[PDB]
Amino acid sequence: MLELLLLTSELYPDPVLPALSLLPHTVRTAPAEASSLLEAGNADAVLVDARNDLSSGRGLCRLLSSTGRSIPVLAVVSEGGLVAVSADWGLDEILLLSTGPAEIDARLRLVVG
Amino acid sequence: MLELLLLTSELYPDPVLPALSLLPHTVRTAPAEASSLLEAGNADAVLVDARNDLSSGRGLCRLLSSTGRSIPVLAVVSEGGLVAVSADWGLDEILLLSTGPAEIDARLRLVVG
């Protein structure tokens, strides 16, 4: 069903959200820059890889958010990064890198519909 | 810091969300019935125990998110009930029973202000 644009420096989606492969959603990766948004095409959501660099991660999410009208922004963080996540990120949903497939599916459904 | 209302048929909150006790928030329990709505009072959020009875769980959530009610509604669900969770529940957040303290805290913060 869903197309996901994952913004990361990884070059494979698997280190970012390992469980995502188990789901039928399609994932394209792009560098963690604001210009990658151009590459968002028909994507249903954008995931921002914020596992390691929280400052840039939060910066991206802020830039990505709102404007119009707008497509959902998700941040993927590690457990130690949860304290840094707050409303000023402009997030629609947050995900832990260890989140299981069922939980990934549920949060994606709820954030898109 | 937060006052939480947990709607559950359990005697204690710990079987529902074991990690919650590790946080400083205070938790009041009430039966998983419609009359418990009268007890919401000044809680900052209401958690509905939907680990075992999903139907009454969602019925409860729909009532909590009804006409003149502002308090954020959270459902606590098991991993194999995530699939039943959808927009018609009127949820502001979901939690898995196995969710850790750092994630509970982050989702409670994000859901309130």
Side-chain angles (χ1 to χ4, degrees), chain A residues 82 85 93-94 107 109, chain B residues 85 93-94 103 107 109:
Chain A
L82 280 165
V85 174
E93 182 63 281
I94 181 77
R107 311 206 107 103
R109 291 198 323 275
Chain B
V85 170
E93 254 289 18
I94 18 135
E103 190 177 343
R107 312 205 101 106
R109 281 189 286 114

Side-chain angles (χ1 to χ4, degrees), chain A residues 79 82-87 91 93-96 99-103 105-107 109-110 113, chain B residues 79 82-87 91 93-96 99-103 105-107 109-110 113:
Chain A
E79 205 170 12
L82 280 165
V83 285
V85 174
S86 58
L91 291 184
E93 182 63 281
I94 181 77
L95 292 167
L96 274 182
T99 290
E103 196 178 341
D105 183 68
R107 311 206 107 103
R109 291 198 323 275
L110 288 158
Chain B
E79 200 164 359
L82 281 171
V83 89
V85 170
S86 52
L91 291 180
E93 254 289 18
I94 18 135
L95 291 166
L96 276 200
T99 299
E103 190 177 343
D105 188 62
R107 312 205 101 106
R109 281 189 286 114
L110 289 180

Side-chain angles (χ1 to χ4, degrees), chain B residues 20-42:
Chain B
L20 222 212
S21 31
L22 296 167
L23 301 179
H25 310 304
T26 37
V27 206
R28 292 157 49 231
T29 63
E33 290 145 9
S35 59
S36 294
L37 264 73
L38 306 186
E39 282 293 273
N42 253 268

Side-chain angles (χ1 to χ4, degrees), chain A:
Chain A
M1 50 141 162
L2 300 183
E3 279 192 33
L4 306 176
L5 208 221
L6 195 225
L7 302 192
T8 180
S9 76
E10 295 276 338
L11 297 93
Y12 287 145
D14 303 60
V16 186
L17 256 191
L20 226 199
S21 26
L22 297 163
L23 294 181
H25 311 302
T26 156
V27 174
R28 296 172 302 116
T29 61
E33 297 183 15
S35 63
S36 290
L37 239 199
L38 298 217
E39 286 307 29
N42 282 110
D44 296 300
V46 179
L47 320 198
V48 176
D49 173 13
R51 280 137 67 243
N52 294 113
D53 196 288
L54 287 165
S55 340
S56 323
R58 137 159 209 292
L60 256 176
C61 294
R62 293 178 58 87
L63 299 193
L64 279 154
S65 30
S66 221
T67 190
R69 209 217 302 266
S70 354
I71 159 184
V73 174
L74 303 251
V76 175
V77 285
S78 93
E79 205 170 12
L82 280 165
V83 285
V85 174
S86 58
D88 75 325
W89 287 51
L91 291 184
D92 290 287
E93 182 63 281
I94 181 77
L95 292 167
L96 274 182
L97 83 95
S98 59
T99 290
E103 196 178 341
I104 294 169
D105 183 68
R107 311 206 107 103
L108 285 178
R109 291 198 323 275
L110 288 158
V111 88
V112 168

